[PDB]
């Protein structure tokens, strides 16, 4: 699945 | 009751778990719809909707027995219909009929499905999914797949109720809680764009006894207030909080929570940079001429140019923008396939790939692909690669400097720093008279419409993209297939359309890469199959069509969740994405409490995975 880079800044 | 409160950042374009391949959809539906199997706390594949299963001695036929205390519910928790085997026939036919973006998961696996999708057949009765009775589903495969059961953790193999499909028509799967039926752990109570996502525990869920939060609220987080996460955790409003060592506050936070800062492990999600090889949209650019635009369209097709960027890209500097300079390397990922994703002959994937690099030139000599370090950054190697790139490009009429467009959300203050680190690094090594990274700060609508939520390659509006892949099943092909020209899930992010194989794709060798994937997939012995994909990953690294940057995990946080209570999965959507099995507590976990739990979990996991592989034989007919 395609993961957005954005999520890594709160994950 | 007990509540889990945190944030989210991606509104979904759709709830259509059968048609989408974007994490923005699967992350949510993981909590609302169950498939045949799921994960325990140790990564084992355990019963779900299916309470038992068998595989034939030739590995081609999988039969699943469904429990019958499983039902579909409306968004308000009212019972709609029992879950039945026909729902899996309906699901697969629907995904085929609507040309799902995740069809690569099943198109070349389910017998007769490729024939059905391409119109070579018209009768779904020839496709290898059958409802033998109401509780019995049977799949027939083209060839044996040891990773097949892991595929059932992906949403394209989730069931759907045909009568609800008929009754809803084109309204099915829209971004509205009422657009789908529910059989998973939660009901969705609120889905409000850029405001919140809210789950309520479904008390009539078949496995309600394993759901330990009654409410889950996710608040929208746009990146503009990074101190919001810690501030709300400390106030008792968030169950967890990711920390930002680069922040103003971290000095006080570090001392206040010196015994509570917890660092996660890097997981199987891999981020990488890629170029737009066929750019068609220039709404967001600093180029002012068509010689500049065409010069950039030329540079990204040249391998020496892509390698120069690869060697001029300082990953440590990039990671320090979000992790502080102490933890800058804790997130570095250097392949698309994680280095330990599979093991071959006792040596894992990253070592074998590092050995395959021996046939791709002098600039890869003795490379180390291990997590947590930067093997790529090498200024003088970058200067030598660019010198050759410039000689070759200038003979074509290419004008320098090469301008490269990179987008970023105007609210994402951490992301602005990371992208500025990349501009500073590359321009420092190659010179701003040779390359210029033009940073484009966009609204949320411009960012999504030109990137992640663009629906065509033509709409991609950038020269440089930073995206990532989450593994859908337990085989290296889940990562490496995404750039293949036939059905690559990531192709549009490269500016190419699957099934077109234009001359820009051939100019960079993606047709060759695609041919290698075909031959690698036919290999059924795991050791070779993996060694063949290692050679393919090596080819992709040398091509520098991707620049591996970072993984998920490896980040600091404060926690009020119980350590190692939630499910875990190397691949799929039923691991960390699910709020099942997760437990919250009053006390802030201490670093030492987490470390003791990690040690206990690591030992329980080795024993559990051992007994799980031993149990597998019981299931063979």
User: B155 and B405 in contact (C-beta within 8 Å)?
Assistant: no
User: B523 and B476 in contact (C-beta within 8 Å)?
Assistant: no
> B468 — contact with chain A (CB < 8 Å)?
yes
Dist. CA B474–CA B466, nearest whole Å? 24
Residue B167 is encoded by which pair of tokens? 């009754």
Beta strands B435-442 and B402-409, pairing class: parallel
Closest CA to B279 of B503, B446, B493: B493
Closest CA to B539 of B563, B566, B519: B519
The architecture that CATH gives domain B15-186+225-264+555-621 is: Alpha-Beta Complex (3.90)
User: B244 and B321 in contact (C-beta within 8 Å)?
Assistant: no
Q: Is B270 helix (H, G, I), strand (E, B) or coil?
A: strand
Maximal C-alpha separation, chain A:
19
Strand partners, B506: none
> B271 — contact with chain A (CB < 8 Å)?
yes
Interface contact B242-A10, CB threshold 8 A: yes
Dist. CA A11–CA B18, nearest whole Å? 26
Q: Is B240 helix (H, G, I), strand (E, B) or coil?
A: strand
Dist. CA B521–CA B109, nearest whole Å? 11
> B229 — contact with chain A (CB < 8 Å)?
yes
Q: How deeply is B167 buried, as exposed, middle or buried, from its count of CB atoms within 10 A (0-12, 13-18, 19+)?
A: exposed
Q: Is B461 helix (H, G, I), strand (E, B) or coil?
A: coil
Please tell me which of the candidates A3, A9, A10 has its beta carbon nearest to residue B468.
Answer: A3
B581: left (phi over 0), alpha (psi -120 to 50) or beta: left
Dist. CA B310–CA B304, nearest whole Å? 10
Interface contact A2-B23, CB threshold 8 A: yes
Within 10 Å of residue B300's Cβ, how many Cβ atoms?
24
* B140, containing H or E segment: strand B136-140
Interface contact B22-A7, CB threshold 8 A: no
Please tell me which of the candidates A1, A9, A10 has its beta carbon nearest to residue B23.
Answer: A1
Q: Is B512 helix (H, G, I), strand (E, B) or coil?
A: helix
End-to-end Cα spacing for chain A: 17
Helices (H), B204-301: 228-234, 250-256, 290-299
DSSP B192-229: ETTTEEEEEE-TTSTTGGG---SEEEEEE--SS-TTHH
User: B141 and B128 in contact (C-beta within 8 Å)?
Assistant: yes
Which residues of A fall within a CB distance of 8 Å from B26?
1
Q: How far is B434 from chain A (nearest CA, A)?
A: 28
Residue B11 is encoded by which pair of tokens? 């509104």
Residue B231 is encoded by which pair of tokens? 């501030």
Q: For B453, which DSSP code? A: T
Per-residue burial over B258-294, b if 16 or more Cβ lie within 10 Å, else e, is eebbbbbebbbbbbbbbbbbbbebeebbebeeeebbe
Q: What 3 state SS string does B359-411 have?
A: HCCCCCCCCCCCCCCCCCCCHHHHHHHHHHHHHHHHCCCCCCCEEEEEEEECC
Residue B406 is encoded by which pair of tokens? 């990179």
Please tell me which of the candidates A1, A8, A10 has its beta carbon nearest to residue B472.
Answer: A1
Interface contact A5-B466, CB threshold 8 A: yes
Closest CA to B402 of B490, B309, B518: B309
Dist. CA B277–CA B546, nearest whole Å? 12
Dist. CA B416–CA B426, nearest whole Å? 16
Dist. CA B571–CA B583, nearest whole Å? 22
Would you give the distance in Å from CA B414 to the centre of its chain?
21
Beta strands B240-242 and B262-263, pairing class: unpaired
Count how many pairs of residues, chain A against chain B, have C-beta atoms within 8 Å: 77
Question: Residues 1-11, chain A: which have Cβ within 8 Å of B?
Answer: 1-11
Please tell me which of the candidates B229, B468, B553 has its beta carbon nearest to residue A5.
Answer: B468
Q: Give the helix, strand, coil percentages of chain B, each rounded to 5.
A: 35, 20, 45
User: B394 and B400 in contact (C-beta within 8 Å)?
Assistant: yes
Q: Is B299 helix (H, G, I), strand (E, B) or coil?
A: helix
Please tell me which of the candidates B6, B223, B470 has its beta carbon nearest to residue A9.
Answer: B223
Interface contact B221-A8, CB threshold 8 A: no
Q: Which technique was the structure solved with, according to the deposited record?
A: X-ray
Dist. CA B590–CA B87, nearest whole Å? 45
Closest CA to B443 of B412, B464, B469: B412
Dist. CA B502–CA B147, nearest whole Å? 32
Within 10 Å of residue B455's Cβ, how many Cβ atoms?
10
Q: How long is chain A?
A: 11
Half-sphere exposure of B589 (CA within 13 A, CB side): 27
Would you give the distance in Å from CA B137 to the centre of its chain?
28
Residue ranges of domains in chain B? 15-186+225-264+555-621, 270-551
Interface contact B271-A8, CB threshold 8 A: yes
CATH number of B270-551: 3.10.105.10
């Amino acid at each position: 699945a395609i993961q957005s880079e954005k999520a890594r800044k709160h994950n | 009751s007990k509540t889990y409160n945190y944030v989210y950042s991606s509104d979904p374009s759709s709830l259509n778990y059968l048609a989408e391949n974007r994490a923005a959809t699967s992350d949510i539906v993981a909590n609302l719809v169950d498939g045949l199997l799921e994960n325990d706390q140790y990564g084992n594949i355990i019963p779900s909707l299916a309470e038992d299963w068998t595989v034939s001695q030739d590995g081609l036929t999988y039969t699943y027995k469904l429990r019958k205390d499983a039902k579909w519910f409306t968004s308000e928790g009212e019972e709609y219909a029992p879950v039945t085997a026909q729902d899996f026939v309906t699901g697969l036919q629907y995904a085929a009929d609507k040309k799902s973006e995740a069809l690569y998961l099943v198109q070349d696996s389910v017998a007769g499905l490729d024939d059905y999708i391409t119109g070579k057949t018209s009768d779904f009765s020839t496709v290898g999914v059958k409802a033998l009775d109401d509780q019995t589903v049977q799949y027939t495969l083209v060839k044996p797949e040891l990773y097949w059961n892991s595929k059932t953790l992906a949403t394209i193999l989730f069931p759907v109720n045909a009568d609800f499909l008929k009754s809803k028509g084109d309204d099915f799967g829209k971004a509205d809680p009422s657009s789908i039926l529910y059989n998973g752990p939660f009901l969705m109570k609120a889905l409000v764009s850029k405001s919140a996502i809210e789950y309520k525990k479904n008390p009539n869920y078949w496995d309600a006894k394993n759901v330990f939060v009654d409410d889950v609220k996710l608040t929208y987080y746009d990146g503009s207030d990074q101190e919001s996460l810690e501030r709300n955790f400390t106030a008792g409003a968030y169950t967890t909080a990711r920390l930002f060592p680069n922040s103003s506050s971290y000095e006080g936070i570090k001392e206040k929570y010196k015994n509570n800062i917890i660092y996660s492990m890097q997981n199987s999600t891999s981020y990488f940079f890629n170029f737009n090889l066929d750019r068609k949209s220039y709404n967001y650019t600093s180029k002012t001429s068509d010689i500049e635009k065409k010069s950039t369209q030329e540079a990204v097709l040249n391998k020496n140019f892509r390698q120069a960027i690869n060697f001029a890209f300082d990953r440590t500097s990039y990671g320090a923008q979000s992790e502080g300079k102490e933890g800058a390397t804790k997130i570095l990922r250097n392949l698309v396939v994680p280095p330990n994703f599979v093991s071959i002959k006792g040596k894992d994937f990253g070592e074998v790939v590092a050995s395959k690099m021996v046939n791709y030139g002098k600039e890869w000599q003795g490379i180390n692909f291990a997590d947590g370090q930067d093997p790529y950054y090498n200024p003088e190697k970058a200067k030598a690669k660019f010198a050759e790139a410039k000689k070759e490009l200038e003979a074509k009429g290419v004008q320098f400097p090469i301008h490269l467009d990179k987008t970023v959300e105007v609210t994402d203050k951490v992301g602005i720093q990371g992208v500025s680190s990349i501009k500073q690094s590359i321009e420092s090594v190659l010179g701003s008279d040779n390359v210029v990274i033009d940073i484009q700060q966009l609204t949320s609508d411009e960012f999504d419409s030109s990137g992640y939520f663009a629906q065509t390659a033509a709409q991609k509006d950038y020269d440089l993209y930073h995206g990532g892949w989450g593994p859908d099943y337990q085989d290296p092909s889940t990562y490496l297939d995404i750039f293949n020209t036939n059905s690559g899930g990531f192709l549009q992010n490269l500016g190419l359309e699957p099934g077109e194989a234009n001359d820009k794709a051939k100019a960079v060798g993606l047709d060759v890469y695609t041919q290698m994937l075909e031959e690698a997939n036919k290999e059924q012995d795991p050791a070779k199959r993996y060694e063949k994909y290692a050679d393919i990953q090596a080819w992709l690294i040398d091509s520098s069509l991707v620049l591996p940057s970072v993984s998920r995990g490896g980040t600091p946080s404060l926690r009020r969740t119980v350590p190692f209570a939630a499910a875990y999965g190397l691949t799929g959507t039923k691991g960390v994405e699910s709020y099942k099995y997760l437990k919250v507590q009053d006390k802030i976990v201490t670093t030492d409490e987490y470390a003791k739990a990690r040690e206990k979990w690591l030992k329980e996991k080795e024993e559990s995975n051992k007994k799980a592989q031993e149990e597998l034989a019981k299931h063979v007919k």
